[PDB]
Design a protein around this ligand. Structure first.
Ligand SMILES: C[C@H](CCC(=O)NCCC[N+](C)(C)C[C@H](O)CS(=O)(=O)O)[C@H]1CC[C@H]2[C@@H]3[C@H](O)C[C@@H]4C[C@H](O)CC[C@]4(C)[C@H]3C[C@H](O)[C@]12C
Ligand SMILES: C[C@H](CCC(=O)NCCC[N+](C)(C)C[C@H](O)CS(=O)(=O)O)[C@H]1CC[C@H]2[C@@H]3[C@H](O)C[C@@H]4C[C@H](O)CC[C@]4(C)[C@H]3C[C@H](O)[C@]12C
Ligand SMILES: [Mg+2]
Ligand SMILES: [Zn+2]
Ligand SMILES: [Zn+2]
Ligand SMILES: [Zn+2]
Lengths: 72, 43, 50, 1347
């Protein structure tokens, strides 16, 4: 084939694997938790409605994402 | 002995750097000819 | 925690360590280290951010 | 000159004089006025022969008769001038000097030959430090170095009976003064007394070295040059360039330096300068010679008048420009050419077009011969003037030389052995090599300006090979799998897919035809469309009889299109092949069935007929593309509004503090990809069934003729993804970091793309470019690395005569059967005979080439596993027998004798490797049977609980799915003690759950049903105060080591099982009483006071990515142990614990009675997936994680590791959807696990802990145990390819691809009489390759030798 078509297939692979990585991160399935899995605080049922199966609060979730920003 | 720690890190990590080797090296020589010899030896 | 690692205490010890790190085996000296650290980054001669 | 093996060894000085033709003495080269050579410098006349052929230097003797006489005036032996190219002169180095290779090779040759560290050698050489040389017996060790003042004193110490030098004189004195038999006796002594395995290890190693260096013909002092040869004059010329400027090589410069320094040292010696002067001079000469040889290892090269370091003798051999890789493999080639390739559909597939002018330039010698034959030019010069006039008759004579003369046509990178195919020629106007169309898929060559090169085969053997082996119509089966590689590609399949389709109401609806012939007579005259559904009377010839062809007329119910396609289908095929839509997959399995039924000739002529009719009706379709062809969904604006409102939802909810930034970003990207898939589906359903037309009635819908849809349906080009981007929106551009941008492209290509959206597209577009720029420049690294290891391998026996193959079954990964058995036992030859499930029979003899007839039988009788012979267990010595490689090839018959399978194997594994993502790439609690079929349990250890359900007490019980056929239809891996429902070998119903268990937590369920108590459970010591304390659950759970006391570490956490009184019943079968002990974190719930039921959760114990790139394959063959090695059993017996937590806790396993004591140290940061009271089988999963292939090879055996590697790399391919047959991977493995190790030499003569390769030791013990004696135990190894290629019987081979210097020097000291009989070896030394046609020739020389 051509030097463009190979690049098309590689770009499709790259965007596919990215999109699947970020669909895998979202939960949308699990059992209701009723309270944080880190601090014990309650998860308000609105946030649980937005994501079925939120193992964390918003506070602990933000904290964990924020430590993970430095990738450790 | 620490240069031997450079050796074991080069074994594990799978590479090194000018900063790494220049870190571990034995002080007080720094002629840059002994350095080029020792870098060729680590290669 | 870097202070934890920091062996040297005052200006003299730090200047001595920098002086020996710049040039190996050169014996440490008061004006020696002082001029070395004054000419590493702080004199018109050897350092000029354009 | 059919000489022999080549031989290498040290360069003895008097030998270097026998090579000489007179000492070079002076640094002059030429004479600056008359450009004759000054005598005598690097150049000369009397030393290295005459300048002009048969002419003296001064010019006294200038006739052929005077050859041989040396002129009395300037002593120049009047002879040919090519003798200027073979004479070596020498230098008489005044002081000696150390050869840099035998000094700085890495492991110093002199270091571990004198038993001396390198720094002291550099001392004695560069005059750092004195050194003793046979200091007698007063005080000083022989090697005992000194320094200045110490030698000064010692001269006063022992001025007499003393001997201390320094310089090359010292090393030479040591080496000469050494006596090797003495050191052999001394080393055998200390091998006797000094009983220290490290100590006598290195002792026996050095004695190995010295005995090797003795059994060569060498002497230890030849490593220190006294006489140094000069390369001749014409390998380092001094060419006269135009203008007086000369363009010399660099060796002239280096030798000039060395001759200067030698003369200067001699001059210093005559004066007897003070010792600083002579010392600095000898150092200068040492550096000069060391720069002559290698110009490296010395620390800093001596660059010439450029700033570029000047190349040297160890550098004209090395590198990708040294003579090995750059002029002994890649050499220019007369009789070649090239051009822009082009299309040329008017050709049968066995003839490439070709220009008149390239032809008349390639075949000048042939033309000249023919023209002096037909008397059109009496002399050859006349024939040249003729064919240089391009007269009338030389075109006729060229057509008479180009009748049957196959030109080889090559493309730029020749990956796989179809890359170089021959063709006949067909003389052509123009200058484009009009290639065939079908073959372009094989070359991998579109026509965007790609340039193929034509060679020409000169001889007659080469013409018969360019016809009977490399012709175009003998390589249509791809070497890496039986499927034809003549798949019709893009205009041809669109032609057929337009031809054989059916629109609902075209002209000539329903009218019957008398056959195909008047189907064409209807279509061409126009009375009926090309496609409109129509009864015909086809007549298909099925050939079920033995070779017969039984005609059978009928009235198939077809179109006109299929029928007019039918006039081209040959006899044996059945009409149900061309009655369908004929896409690309179907149009290729058309050719596949043709080749599987009718052989090769009708498949070739049929592929040509297909291309002809395909192009014709593809042109008749007018299959054009226009801007009304890409239909947007009218339900697109709604979907984009809806998703762009859902993002409004997540924005509002983010600024209410309900979700972090990461969560809203993920949710946004999730709703955009969802909108994307919905819009793409909406367009594709507005696109596929869109056409709605009407047969004599209301309306009806059918697959559409939207030109872009046929181009996306046939398989011609594109797919639903590109049709997405042309009509629906186009996704989410992924920025090159890897992170996907969140601002999707709500527009498409039929609409515009405003500035932001196009620009965001730029990221991913340029990442695709910047990767397919690195891929085209590093495309053949894997094939290179494989043919380095798997090259000298040639099918050199008709039948190895064994009965030991590997068991083939259809892979099933917990679901629908991935790879059936007819794709794996298709070609390989059976190992032991096959019995129909009643045994009933002898279904197939053990040596039956399983062609498709036998797969027919095996699939008619439902055979499940066929123990088939395999390349990795062939019993041949330096080769692979005929059968065991099987049959696969571009042909379809058994592999011939000699056909070099190592190379075509490495290329079968390496050419699809172009078709794989170069970056690595990661894809990411109940059992549910699919359908009807009985249950099948292997290694099942179940207990008939008093509860009723079934539970497995074996760690490794596989849950299969068998039918009443007996086949294995499904298999599942039950965890430990899963709650099981149905029977063991019994029947179940389809789609019904049969097994449930605990997802994350491990049951410890009892063995039999008996009373319970506790032992050694003291809280604070062994147990803790656990409880679901809202429920009363007293849980005194086993304490870990960090919570158990230092005597608590000596305690045994336990669960005792009491009988009805207080005793402990024996475990059934064994005599360990009834109880279970438990480790830390063996979480207890109940306590003493209950009788257990089988299936009691006495405890609760808590707790895949498939890389798919090419680098996964590179690391599979490299065999690198992974990060988390799957800890694995070592001795088939009972399990236990060891010395508790010395950082790494120690396992202990024990057999029934034998060598029990094996304990293993494990990082206790990782789970141990073994019980504390079980009998772990050898090769059993103590832990999890990827298990190292070395451990497979050492624990289980060969066939286990080979099935491992083949299934792993087959996963890496059939993930991507690439077919490659497993012969090739098995042969690369047989080259992997070639070396071996020894356990007890015994009745052989190999060192015990020595590593030797399998073929040698196996022939040794085979012939010994063939005698009355006893064999030798060997533990097989397994090397990565990059290391398994690193050992080679030849050194000429290993001087190519390994680093040359280490190879040359190791062989040199070892005196390794390298034979020929490789392929790198003979391709280097330019005789017949012993692989293909050359094999009979080498058998000829084998007969010559040894008689
Ligand atoms: C781009 C590449 C073709 C290039 C030739 C094709 C061939 C195999 C494809 C992946 C696999 O199917 C596994 C997985 C399937 C999921 O459904 C979607 C994601 C995955 C990761 C796919 C991404 C991509 O689409 C791949 C790499
Ligand atoms: C440096 C340059 C590399 C490409 C940049 C190389 C490539 C061609 C070389 C010249 C040619 O030989 C012609 C000419 C021959 C005379 O007799 C000697 C001088 C000339 C000018 C050469 C000097 C130099 O070597 C050139 C420029
Ligand atoms: Mg191209
Ligand atoms: Zn919380
Ligand atoms: Zn003469
Ligand atoms: Zn075999």
């Amino acid at each position: 084939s051509d030097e463009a078509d190979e690049a098309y297939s590689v770009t499709e692979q790259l965007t596919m694997t990215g999109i699947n990585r970020i669909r895998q991160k979202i939960n949308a399935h699990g059992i209701p938790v009723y309270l944080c899995e880190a601090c014990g605080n309650p998860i308000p049922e609105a946030r649980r409605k937005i994501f079925p199966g939120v193992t964390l609060c918003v506070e602990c979730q933000a904290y964990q994402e924020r430590q993970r920003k430095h990738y450790a | 002995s620490q240069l031997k720690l450079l050796v074991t890190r080069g074994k594990e990590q799978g590479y090194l750097t000018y900063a790494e080797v220049n870190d571990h090296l034995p002080e007080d020589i720094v002629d840059s000819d002994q350095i080029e010899d020792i870098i060729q030896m680590i290669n | 925690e870097t202070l934890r690692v920091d062996p040297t205490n005052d200006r003299l010890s730090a200047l001595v360590e920098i002086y020996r790190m710049m040039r190996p085996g050169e014996p440490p000296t008061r004006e020696a280290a002082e001029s070395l650290f004054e000419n590493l980054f702080f004199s018109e001669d050897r350092y000029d951010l354009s | 000159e059919e000489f022999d093996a080549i031989k290498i060894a040290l360069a003895s000085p008097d030998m270097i004089r026998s090579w000489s033709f007179g000492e070079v003495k002076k640094p002059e080269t030429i004479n600056y006025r008359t450009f004759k050579p000054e005598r005598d410098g690097l150049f000369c006349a009397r030393i290295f022969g005459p300048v002009k052929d048969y002419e003296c230097l001064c010019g006294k003797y200038k006739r052929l008769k005077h050859r041989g006489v040396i002129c009395e005036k300037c002593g120049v032996e009047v002879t040919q001038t090519k003798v200027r190219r073979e004479r070596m002169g020498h230098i008489e180095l005044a002081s000696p000097t150390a050869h840099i290779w035998f000094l700085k090779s890495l492991p110093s040759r002199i270091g571990l030959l004198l038993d001396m560290p390198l720094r002291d050698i550099e001392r004695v050489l560069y005059f750092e430090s004195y050194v003793v040389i046979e200091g007698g017996m007063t005080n000083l060790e022989r090697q005992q170095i000194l320094t200045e003042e110490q030698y000064l004193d010692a001269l006063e110490e022992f001025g007499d009976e003393f001997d201390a030098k320094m310089g090359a004189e010292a090393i030479q004195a040591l080496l000469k003064s050494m006596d090797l038999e003495q050191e052999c006796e001394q080393l055998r002594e200390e091998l006797n007394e000094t009983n220290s395995e490290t100590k006598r290890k290195k002792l026996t190693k050095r004695i190995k070295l010295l005995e090797a260096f003795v059994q060569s013909g060498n002497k230890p002092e030849w490593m220190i040059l006294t006489v140094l040869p000069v390369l001749p004059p014409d390998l380092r010329p001094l060419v006269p360039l135009d203008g007086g400027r000369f363009a010399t090589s660099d060796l002239n410069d280096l030798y000039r330096r060395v001759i200067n320094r030698n003369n200067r040292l001699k001059r210093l010696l005559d004066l007897a300068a003070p010792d600083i002067i002579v010392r600095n001079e000898k150092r200068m000469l040492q550096e000069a010679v060391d720069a002559l040889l290698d110009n490296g290892r010395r620390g800093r090269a001596i660059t010439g008048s450029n700033k570029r370091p000047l190349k040297s003798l160890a550098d004209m051999i090395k590198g990708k420009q040294g003579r090995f890789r750059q002029n002994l493999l890649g050499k220019r080639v007369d009789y070649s050419g090239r051009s822009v390739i082009t299309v040329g559909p008017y050709l049968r597939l066995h003839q490439c077009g070709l220009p008149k002018k390239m032809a008349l330039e390639l075949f000048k010698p042939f033309i000249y011969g023919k023209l002096e034959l037909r008397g059109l030019a009496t002399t050859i010069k006349a024939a040249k003037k003729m064919v240089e006039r391009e007269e009338a008759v030389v075109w006729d004579i060229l057509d008479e030389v180009i009748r049957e003369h196959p030109v080889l046509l090559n493309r730029a990178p020749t990956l796989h052995r179809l890359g170089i195919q021959a063709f006949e020629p067909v003389l052509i106007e123009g200058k484009a090599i009009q290639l065939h169309p079908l073959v372009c898929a094989a070359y991998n060559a579109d026509f965007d300006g790609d340039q193929m090169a034509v060679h020409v085969p000169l001889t007659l053997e080469a013409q018969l090979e360019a016809r009977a082996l490399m012709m175009s119509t003998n390589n249509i089966l791809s070497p890496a799998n039986g499927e034809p590689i003549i798949v019709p590609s893009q205009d041809v399949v669109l032609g057929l897919y337009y031809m054989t389709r059916d629109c609902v109401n075209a002209k000539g609806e329903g009218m019957v035809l008398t056959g195909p012939k008047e189907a064409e007579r209807l279509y061409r005259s126009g009375l009926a469309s090309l496609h409109a559904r129509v009864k015909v009377r086809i007549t298909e010839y099925e050939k079920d009889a033995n070779g017969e062809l039984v005609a059978k007329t009928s009235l198939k119910d077809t179109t006109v299109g299929r029928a007019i396609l039918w006039m081209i289908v040959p006899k044996g095929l059945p009409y149900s092949i061309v009655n369908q839509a004929l896409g690309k997959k179907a149009i290729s399995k058309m050719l596949n069935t043709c080749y599987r039924i009718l052989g090769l000739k009708p498949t070739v002529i049929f592929a040509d007929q297909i291309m002809y009719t395909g192009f014709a009706y593809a042109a008749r379709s007018g299959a054009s593309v226009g801007i009304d062809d890409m239909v947007i969904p009218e339900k697109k604006h709604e979907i984009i509004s809806e998703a762009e409102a859902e993002v409004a939802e997540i924005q509002e909810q983010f600024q209410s503090g309900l979700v972090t930034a990461g969560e809203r970003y993920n949710k946004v990207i999730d709703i955009w990809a969802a909108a994307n898939d919905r819009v793409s589906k909406a367009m594709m359903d507005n696109l596929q069934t869109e056409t709605v037309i009407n047969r004599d009635g209301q309306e009806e819908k059918q697959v559409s003729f939207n030109s872009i849809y046929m181009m996306a349906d046939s398989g011609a080009r594109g797919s639903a993804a590109q049709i997405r981007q042309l009509a629906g929106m186009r996704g989410l551009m992924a920025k090159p970091d890897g992170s996907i941008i969140e601002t999707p492209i709500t527009a498409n290509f039929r609409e515009g793309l405003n500035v932001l959206q196009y620009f965001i597209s730029t990221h991913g577009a340029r990442k695709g470019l910047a990767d397919t720029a690195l891929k085209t420049a590093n495309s053949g690294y894997l094939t290179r690395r494989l043919v380095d290891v798997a090259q000298d391998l040639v099918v050199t026996e008709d039948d190895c005569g064994t009965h030991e193959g590997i068991m083939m079954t259809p892979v099933i990964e917990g679901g629908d059967v991935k790879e059936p058995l007819r794709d794996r036992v298709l070609g390989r030859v059976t190992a032991e005979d096959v019995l129909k499930p009643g045994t009933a029979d002898i279904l197939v003899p053990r040596n039956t080439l399983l062609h498709e007839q036998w797969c027919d039988l095996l699939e008619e009788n439902s055979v499940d596993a066929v123990k088939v012979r395999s390349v990795v267990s062939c019993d041949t010595d330096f080769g692979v027998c005929a059968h065991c490689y099987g049959r696969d090839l571009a042909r379809g018959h058994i592999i011939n004798k000699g056909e070099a399978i190592g190379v075509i194997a490495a290329q079968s594994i390496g050419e699809p490797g172009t078709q794989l993502t170069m970056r690595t790439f990661h894809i990411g609690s109940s059992i549910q049977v699919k359908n009807k079929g009985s249950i099948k349990l292997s290694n099942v250890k179940s207990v008939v609980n008093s509860s009723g359900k079934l539970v497995i007490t074996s760690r490794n019980t596989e849950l299969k799915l068998i039918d009443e056929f007996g086949r294995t239809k499904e298999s599942y891996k039950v965890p430990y003690g899963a709650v099981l429902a149905k029977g063991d070998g019994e029947q179940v119903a389809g789609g019904e759950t049969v097994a449930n268990w605990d997802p994350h937590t491990m049951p410890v369920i009892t063995e039999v049903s008996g009373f319970v108590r506790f032992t050694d459970m003291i809280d604070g010591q062994t147990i803790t105060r656990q409880t679901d304390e809202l429920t009363g659950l007293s849980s005194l759970v086993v304490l870990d080591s960090a919570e158990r006391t230092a005597g608590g570490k000596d305690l045994r956490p336990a669960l005792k099982i009491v009988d009805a009184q207080g005793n402990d019943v024996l475990i059934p079968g064994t005599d360990m009483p009834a109880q279970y002990f438990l480790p830390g974190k063996a979480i207890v719930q109940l306590e003493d006071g209950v009788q257990i039921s089988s299936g009691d959760t006495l405890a609760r114990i808590p707790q895949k990515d498939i890389t798919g790139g090419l680098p996964r394959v590179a690391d599979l063959f490299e065999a690198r142990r992974p990060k988390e090695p799957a800890i694995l059993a070592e001795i088939s017996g009972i399990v236990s614990f060891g010395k508790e937590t010395k950082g790494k806790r120690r396992l202990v396993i024990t057999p029934v009675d034998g060598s029990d004591p094996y304990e293993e140290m494990i990082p206790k940061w990782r789970q141990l997936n073994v019980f504390e009271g079980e009998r772990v089988e050898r090769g059993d999963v103590i832990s999890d994680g990827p298990e190292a292939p070395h451990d497979i090879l050492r624990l289980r055996g060969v066939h286990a590791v080979t099935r491992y590697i083949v299934n792993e790399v087959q996963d890496v391919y059939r993930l991507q959807g690439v077919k490659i047959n497993d012969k090739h991977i098995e042969v690369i493995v047989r080259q992997m696990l070639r070396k071996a190790t020894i356990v007890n030499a015994g009745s052989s003569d190999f060192l015990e802990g020595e590593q030797v390769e399998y073929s040698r030791v196996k022939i040794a013990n085979r012939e010994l145990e063939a005698n009355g004696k006893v064999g030798a135990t060997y533990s097989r190894d397994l090397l990565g390819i990059t290391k398994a290629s690193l050992a080679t019987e030849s050194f000429i081979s290993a001087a190519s691809f390994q680093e040359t210097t280490r190879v040359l020097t190791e062989a040199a000291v070892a005196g390794k009489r390298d034979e020929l009989r490789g392929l790198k070896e003979n391709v280097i030394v330019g005789r017949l390759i012993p692989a293909g046609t050359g094999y009979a020739y080498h058998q000829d020389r084998m007969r010559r030798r040894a008689a």
